[PDB]
């Protein structure tokens, strides 16, 4: 039911509190380089759906549901960056390829990439074999 | 330089040409599920910049440029489809996942995914190991 950009907002709020203990509307406007009225409108939609609350001095506060979604997206980003690093995507492309995947892949597929990432680490000689395949191509 | 929309046309045109020598406007409309008048507008755009030619009583044939692009696009769709099958995504999620991400991955990542698919092809017992990780992880 939440749009991808609603989820990205919860992820950003969780990481703002990780960085300094608070999430402000002004923080999000400055980072996205948008007008603060679009942020307060997004905050309003997230508030009405019970993902966050707002109190003027503490700022933006995640609910149990909002904090669960925000953490999940941080870890999705990690998992997919691990995947793309493992298979050899270069540093110029990996970031936009992670943002590309994470917005257009079902959660079933994300889970399967998580199994794959686990597969290459339970016996790391699998990863050396994969890199041999790349070198003999190269 | 070609837009996502052009890439979806060029890929379908290549498949039909691959099967039949020419791509008819009516088969393109059917496959992409758009109104024939949309195809015409795209056909006129792609004709004007030399991706294709319209031949009377035949349909569309790609130029060297359009065919090079269209062949690469079909390779991308087919490689991603194999990739998702291989890591076990539900057969109900596959076409829509592929149509999703295919416009959002660099060619660098497509090549590395190709290295990954080749890694599993060169010793298919690696697919059985991968399946054990997934059954265990559950
Ligand atoms: Mg992100
Ligand atoms: Mn496609
Ligand atoms: Mn597509």
Numbering used by the authors:
A (entry chain A), B (entry chain B): 1 to 138
Article, verbatim:
Mn2+-bound BhMntR crystals were obtained by soaking with 50 mM MnCl2 for one hour in apo crystals. The crystal structure of the Mn2+-bound form was determined at 2.5 Å resolution, and the binuclear manganese ions were clearly evident in the 2Fo-Fc map and omit maps, whereas a magnesium ion was observed in the other subunit. The two manganese ions were found at the interface between the HTH domain and the dimerization domain and formed a binuclear complex separated by 4.5 Å, labeled as the A and C sites (AC conformer). The binuclear manganese ions were liganded by six amino acid residues: Asp8 and Glu11 contributed by domain 1, and His 77, Glu99, Glu102, and His103 contributed by domain 2. The MnA ion was coordinated by seven atoms: Glu11 Oε1/Oε2, His77 Nδ1, Glu99 Oε2, Glu102 Oε1/Oε2, and Wat95 O. In addition, the His77 Nε2 made a hydrogen bond with Glu81 Oε1, while the His77 Nδ1 in the other subunit made a hydrogen bond with Glu81 Oε1 via a water molecule. The Mnc ion was coordinated by five atoms: Asp8 Oδ1, Glu99 Oε1, Glu102 Oε2, His103 Nε2, and Wat37 O, while the C site of BsMntR has octahedral coordination geometry. However, the other subunit contained a magnesium ion which was coordinated by the side chains of Glu99, Glu102, and two water molecules. The side chain of His77, which is strictly conserved in the MntR/IdeR family, had a different rotamer with a hydrogen bond via a water molecule to Glu81 and was also stabilized by π-π interaction with symmetry-related Tyr57. These interactions could block the proper rotamer of His77 to coordinate with MnA ion in this subunit. There were few structural differences between apo and Mn2+-bound dimeric forms, with a r.m.s.d. value of 0.49 Å for 276 Cα atoms.
